[PDB]
Amino acid sequence: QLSRLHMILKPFMLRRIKKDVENELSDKIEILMYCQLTSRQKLLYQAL
Amino acid sequence: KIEEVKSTTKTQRIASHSHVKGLGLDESGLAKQAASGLVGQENAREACGVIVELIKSKKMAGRAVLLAGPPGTGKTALALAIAQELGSKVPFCPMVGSEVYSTEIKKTEVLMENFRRAIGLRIKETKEVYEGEVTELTPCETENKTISHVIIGLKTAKGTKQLKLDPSIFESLQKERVEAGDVIYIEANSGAVKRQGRCDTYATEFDLEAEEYVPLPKGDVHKKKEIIQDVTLHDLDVANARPQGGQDILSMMGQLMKPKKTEITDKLRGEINKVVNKYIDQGIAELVPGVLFVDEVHMLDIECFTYLHRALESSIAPIVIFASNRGNCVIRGTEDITSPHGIPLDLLDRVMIIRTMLYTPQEMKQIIKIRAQTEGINISEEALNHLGEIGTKTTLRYSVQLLTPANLLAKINGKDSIEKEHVEEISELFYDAKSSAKILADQQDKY
Amino acid sequence: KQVTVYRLICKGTIEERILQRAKEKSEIQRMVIS
Numbered sequence: 358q359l360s361r362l363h364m365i366l367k368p369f370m371l372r373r374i375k376k377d378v379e380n381e382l383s384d385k386i387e388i389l390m391y392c393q394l395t396s397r398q399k400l401l402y403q404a405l
Numbered sequence: 406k407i408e409e410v411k412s413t414t415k416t417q418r419i420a421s422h423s424h425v426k427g428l429g430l431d432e433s434g435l436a437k438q439a440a441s442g443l444v445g446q447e448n449a450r451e452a453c454g455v456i457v458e459l460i461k462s463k464k465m466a467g468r469a470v471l472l473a474g475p476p477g478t479g480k481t482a483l484a485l486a487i488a489q490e491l492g493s494k495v496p497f498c499p500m501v502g503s504e505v506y507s508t509e510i511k512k513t514e515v516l517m518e519n520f521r522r523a524i525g526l527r528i529k530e531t532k533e534v535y536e537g538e539v540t541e542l543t544p545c546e547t548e549n550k551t552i553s554h555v556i557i558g559l560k561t562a563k564g565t566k567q568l569k570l571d572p573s574i575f576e577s578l579q580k581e582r583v584e585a586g587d588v589i590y591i592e593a594n595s596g597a598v599k600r601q602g603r604c605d606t607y608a609t610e611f612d613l614e615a616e617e618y619v620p621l622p623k624g625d626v627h628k629k630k631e632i633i634q635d636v637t638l639h640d641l642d643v644a645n646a647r648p649q650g651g652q653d654i655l656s657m658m659g660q661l662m663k664p665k666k667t668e669i670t671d672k673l674r675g676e677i678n679k680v681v682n683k684y685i686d687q688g689i690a691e692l693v694p695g696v697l698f699v700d701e702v703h704m705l706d707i708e709c710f711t712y713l714h715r716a717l718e719s720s721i722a723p724i725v726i727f728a729s730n731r732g733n734c735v736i737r738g739t740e741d742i743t744s745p746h747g748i749p750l751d752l753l754d755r756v757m758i759i760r761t762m763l764y765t766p767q768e769m770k771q772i773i774k775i776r777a778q779t780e781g782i783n784i785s786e787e788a789l790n791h792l793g794e795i796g797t798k799t800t801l802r803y804s805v806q807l808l809t810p811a812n813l814l815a816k817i818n819g820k821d822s823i824e825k826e827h828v829e830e831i832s833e834l835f836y837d838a839k840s841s842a843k844i845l846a847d848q849q850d851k852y
Numbered sequence: 853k854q855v856t857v858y859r860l861i862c863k864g865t866i867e868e869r870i871l872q873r874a875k876e877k878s879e880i881q882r883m884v885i886s
């Protein structure tokens with residue numbers, strides 16, 4: 358069914374992925390930054 | 406792609422009762438074998454199970470218990486268990502019996518300050534307040550000129566108002582050096598003014614100025630709010646005897662002079678009781694009568710033991726917990742008289758005694774385990790079994806006290822956990838009260 | 853230029869459900885394109 362969606366879409370949707378154009382612009386560095394929630398946060402979160 | 410995690414500060418410090426989190430009772434009020442940090446003491450914990458329902462019932466006044474039993478049997482740990490079992494809102498007032506020997510107030514009255522601190526009170530205080538940037542400020546004159554009113558123009562994000570206020574507020578604004586552009590807060594009940602510095606609108610107006618600047622206040626200039634105050638009857642009693650409220654030259658200066666205690670008159674506690682009864686009648690107040698814990702009670706003076714007869718028979722008094730580690734002592738201040746727990750037989754009727762008792766080796770091992778995992782340390786079973794043996798040789802406190810010193814020795818020696826080779830060294834470095842008394846009796850010619 | 857992106861999340865709260873649904877959706881959302 359994915360191949361049916363692709364064969365429907367191919368004649369009327371264009372596609373890229375940036376690396377097919379952007380030979381000289383950066384990829385994102387992406388940071389999942391965790392945080393320790395505070396005392397007032399733990400007190401209200403636990404009460405909820 | 407990347408992950409990051411952060412923390413930047415120390416923990417709470419560990420302390421001698423910090424493993425105790427409650428009495429470890431079941432729904433029937435029976436004691437679990439090991440729960441909430443405590444183990445053993447099932448009779449004393451079941452008894453304290455009645456007492457935590459005694460406190461929470463509120464009906465009773467001046468009921469008292471005496472925890473009695475040898476050194477290290479957990480008496481002050483059980484009063485700490487009660488303090489945790491009641492939670493934060495019911496006041497628990499810790500006291501040590503030797504705190505009555507003040508140099509500012511009579512021994513017979515330090516007790517009343519402690520009693521009155523143990524009756525808590527929750528008040529829905531409505532405070533009504535003015536706040537804003539001061540956009541205009543003018544006093545209005547009258548013949549002996551005197552000031553009759555002040556006009557203050559105040560501004561907030563929600564608008565502006567221009568208020569007639571009392572000359573005591575003007576005297577407060579002058580005291581606080583308030584000027585146009587200052588953000589201020591005034592509460593009309595206290596007549597009390599707080600300056601917060603010039604509004605952020607003025608933060609560009611000089612290249613170099615002493616001021617902190619604040620964002621313009623929000624909501625209307627005049628507004629009222631509840632503060633749900635927690636307060637105690639002592640905190641009402643003292644606050645009237647050396648008054649720091651109001652705004653006059655006298656109250657402004659009672660706030661500077663040395664804060665000496667004073668023998669609060671029985672009449673003031675009378676007029677305070679009338680005022681808090683009116684706040685309870687008005688539904689503004691809830692009383693929360695709590696606990697006074699006189700630890701080491703065996704050394705109150707006989708003056709104090711005889712005062713406790715009047716205090717424990719008061720219709721107002723909190724519930725009281727005493728503790729004693731003592732046998733048939735002489736009663737302090739008498740020189741002649743000896744009695745159980747060091748407490749007069751006259752007072753020893755007025756208390757439900759909770760007998761607290763010595764430990765089996767199994768309970769010592771189990772406390773030492775629960776204690777080791779509270780001090781944050783890993784200990785091998787052969788080393789913990791060896792501390793159980795040191796418990797049978799000496800005392801529970803010495804056996805507990807070796808744990809952290811053994812963990813320092815272990816991490817110096819490069820191990821992750823206490824091995825028996827560490828405890829067997831710490832036992833040689835640090836004597837206990839029994840083993841030191843042997844060398845100190847043998848060498849008694851030279852001390 | 854170089855680009856850096858940060859997400860701020862609280863462990864064990866509710867935002868990890870949002871991140872888990874976001875990961876589950878992002879995996880479904882890849883295969884329908886490439």
Ligand SMILES: Nc1ncnc2c1ncn2[C@@H]1O[C@H](COP(=O)(O)OP(=O)(O)O)[C@@H](O)[C@H]1O
Binds near residue numbers: 483730801
């Ligand atoms: N039943 C118990 N369960 C857990 N810890 C206890 C227990 N009994 C005593 N302790 C702990 O052992 C030590 C001695 O008890 P403590 O209350 O200080 O004795 P005392 O009544 O003589 O003042 C303290 O560290 C205390 O927290």
